[PDB]
């Protein structure tokens, strides 16, 4: 194991967290390793908002490495907003450290109910410098320059609650994680880890859709129209005015997603995008699929996808490698 690993843990059998510390002294926090954002923030010991009570807070004054900044920042997410200011200090991910620029959050009110209801402290962006606010170079990129890692690539082997933990491998591809050949898809832009694939479900086809590989999205995002046409003769129930879709987990009409490029095709069948809703009702399932439209027809291949496919994120080669993850390490 010549490359920097980071154990991931199952969170409510849907999301997952990993740990990393700030300051020359440990000061550990629990993060959501989000390839869908390019900023690293953390709850400041100075936070006054209620959502911070349950969290681990950052004490800049107890770190010889701290380096004041103060320019205020506002991290905007589809799910919430966070306030604070920039500060700099030694960020330790796995067994590697580097003076990094991050946000010391002090107001978390615009990130509820999520934040208070969740176990993570902050979010660690794994996207591209252009997705970042305050133009910060990706962490993995810095590490490469500083010859801390061979190549600027990070790997994701999502965990499974009781089967195995997961891993965020840095600077190296380990076959332990996947079986079969890796297939690379070049990024259509250096923003999100976005590639171009053809989105085919049943009789429905969306050519060259923009597919975003996001470890920070617990669901599978699909453009609204595509989703509607998709659920037509399916016997799925969308509770009125709610993004809540219920089915018999056994519903034999449920389709398998099919994303194809010239190098390969990736499918995501029912067993992967269905969430059990037993307590609601016996043999009942929800879709864990969301209707979401972007300026350009986009699919967010979130956790559900990554849980099935081991993924490689290459900065140096600007592409994403995909391969079937081992059913078990
Ligand atoms: C630079 C901004 O980056 C982004 O806007 C996307 C981030 O990756 C962000 C993660 C940060 C918010 C951490 N993702 C989301 O906001 C997504 N939210 C979720 O996946 C949440 N899941 C649900 O609410 C469940 C439904 C989808 C069923 C999850 C955070 C709990 C949305 C795009 C869907």
- Using DSSP's 3-state secondary structure scheme, residue 131 falls into coil
- Give how far the C-alpha of residue 201 lies from the chain's centroid of Cα atoms, to the nearest Å: 23
Q: Which residue's CA is minimally distant from atom 24 of ligand 1?
A: 79
Atom of ligand 1 at shortest distance to CA of 114?
31
* Ligand 1 centroid to residue 146 C-alpha, Å: 31
Residue whose CB lies within 8 A of the most ligand 1 atoms, among 38, 40, 43, 77, for a mutation test = 77
Report whether 166 contacts 14 (CB < 8 A): no
Residue whose CB lies within 8 A of the most ligand 1 atoms, among 216, 242, 288, for a mutation test = 216
Angle ∠(261,266,269) on CA atoms, nearest 5: 145
State the Cα–Cα distance between residues 273 and 256, nearest whole angstrom. Answer: 9
- One domain, residues 151 and 204: no
Does residue 216's CB lie within 6 angstroms of at least one atom of ligand 1?
Answer: yes
- One domain, residues 84 and 117: yes
185 burial type by CB count under 10 A (0-12 exposed, 13-18 middle, 19+ buried): buried
Q: In the numeric block, which tokens belong to residue 161?
A: 């609650």
Q: In the numeric block, which tokens belong to residue 158?
A: 């999502």
Q: Identify the domain boundary among 122, 140, 175.
A: 175
- One domain, residues 106 and 159: yes
State the Cα–Cα distance between residues 239 and 285, nearest whole angstrom. Answer: 13
Does residue 290's CB lie within 6 angstroms of at least one atom of ligand 1?
Answer: yes
- One domain, residues 180 and 151: no
- One domain, residues 208 and 224: yes
What approach was used to elucidate this structure? X-ray
Q: Identify the domain boundary among 154, 175, 196.
A: 175
Number of domains in the chain: 2
80, 108, 151, 275 from 38: Cα distances, Å: 15, 19, 19, 29
Phi, psi (degrees; rounded to nearest 5) at 163? -80, -65
* Ligand 1 centroid to residue 213 C-alpha, Å: 12
- One domain, residues 193 and 181: yes
Report whether 72 contacts 123 (CB < 8 A): no
What residues contact 241, with CB distance under 8 A and at least 6 apart?
none
Which residues have a catalytic role annotated?
A: 34, 214
Q: Identify the domain boundary among 175, 208, 238.
A: 175
Angle ∠(235,237,241) on CA atoms, nearest 5: 150
Sign, CA torsion 79/266/171/10: positive
State the Cα–Cα distance between residues 266 and 271, nearest whole angstrom. Answer: 15
Residue whose CB lies within 8 A of the most ligand 1 atoms, among 17, 36, 80, 290, for a mutation test = 36
Residue 316: Cβ within 10 Å count: 12
- One domain, residues 141 and 284: no
* Ligand 1 centroid to residue 151 C-alpha, Å: 28
Does residue 122's CB lie within 6 angstroms of at least one atom of ligand 1?
Answer: no
Residue 245: strand pairing partners: 238
Identify the H or E element spanning 324: strand 319-325
Residue 266: Cβ within 10 Å count: 20
- One domain, residues 158 and 266: no
Q: What CATH number is attached to the domain comprising 161? A: 2.40.70.10
- One domain, residues 96 and 241: no
- 41-54 burial: b if 16+ Cβ within 10 Å, else e: bbbbebbebebbee
Residue 276: Cβ within 10 Å count: 12
First to last CA, the chain: 14
State the Cα–Cα distance between residues 101 and 78, nearest whole angstrom. Answer: 23
Q: Which residue's CA is minimally distant from atom 19 of ligand 1?
A: 217
Domain assignment of residue 232, given as a range: 176-329
State the Cα–Cα distance between residues 113 and 99, nearest whole angstrom. Answer: 32
- One domain, residues 135 and 247: no
- One domain, residues 117 and 193: no
Omega prior to 113 cis, within 30 of 0: yes
Q: Which residue's CA is minimally distant from atom 13 of ligand 1?
A: 216
Report whether 165 contacts 159 (CB < 8 A): yes
Does residue 81's CB lie within 6 angstroms of at least one atom of ligand 1?
Answer: no
Does residue 37's CB lie within 6 angstroms of at least one atom of ligand 1?
Answer: yes
State the Cα–Cα distance between residues 236 and 238, nearest whole angstrom. Answer: 7
Q: Which residue's CA is minimally distant from atom 23 of ligand 1?
A: 218
- One domain, residues 100 and 190: no
State the Cα–Cα distance between residues 242 and 113, nearest whole angstrom. Answer: 17
- Residue 109: closest CA among 30, 50, 40, 56: 50
Residue 65: Cβ within 10 Å count: 15
Does residue 21's CB lie within 6 angstroms of at least one atom of ligand 1?
Answer: no
């Amino acid at each position: 194991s010549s490359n920097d690993n980071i154990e991931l843990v199952d969170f409510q059998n849907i999301m997952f967290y990993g740990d990393a510390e700030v300051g020359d002294n440990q000061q550990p926090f629990t993060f959501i390793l989000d390839t869908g954002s390019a900023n690293l923030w953390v709850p400041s010991v100075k936070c006054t908002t209620a959502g911070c009570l349950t969290k681990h807070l950052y004490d800049s004054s107890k770190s010889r490495t701290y380096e004041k900044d103060g320019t205020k920042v506002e991290m905007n997410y589809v799910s919430g907003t966070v306030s604070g200011f920039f500060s700099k200090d030694l960020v330790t991910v796995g067994n590697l450290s580097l003076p990094y620029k991050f946000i010391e959050v002090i107001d978390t009110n615009g990130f509820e109910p999520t934040y208070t209801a969740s176990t993570f402290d902050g979010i660690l962006g794994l996207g591209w410098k252009d997705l970042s606010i305050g133009s910060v170079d990706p962490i993995v990129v810095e590490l490469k320059n500083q010859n801390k890692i061979e190549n600027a690539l990070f790997t994701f082997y999502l965990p499974v609650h009781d089967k195995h933990t997961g891993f965020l491998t840095i600077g190296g591809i380990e076959e332990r994680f996947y079986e079969g050949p890796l297939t690379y898809e070049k990024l259509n832009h250096d923003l999100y880890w976005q590639i171009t694939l053809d989105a085919h479900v049943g009789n429905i086809m969306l050519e060259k859709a923009n597919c975003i590989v996001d470890s920070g999205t617990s669901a599978i995002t699909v453009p609204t129209d595509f989703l509607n046409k998709m659920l037509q003769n399916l016997d799925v129930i969308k509770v009125p005015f709610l993004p809540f879709y219920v089915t018999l987990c056994n519903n034999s009409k449920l389709p398998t997603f099919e994303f194809t490029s010239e190098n390969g095709k990736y499918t995501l069948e029912p067993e992967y995008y269905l969430q059990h809703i037993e307590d609601v009702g016996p043999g009942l399932c929800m879709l864990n699929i969301i209707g979401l439209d972007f300026p350009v027809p986009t699919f967010i291949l979130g956790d559900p996808f990554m849980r099935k496919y081991f993924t490689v994120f290459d900065y140096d080669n600007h592409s994403v490698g995909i391969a079937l993850a081992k059913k078990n390490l």
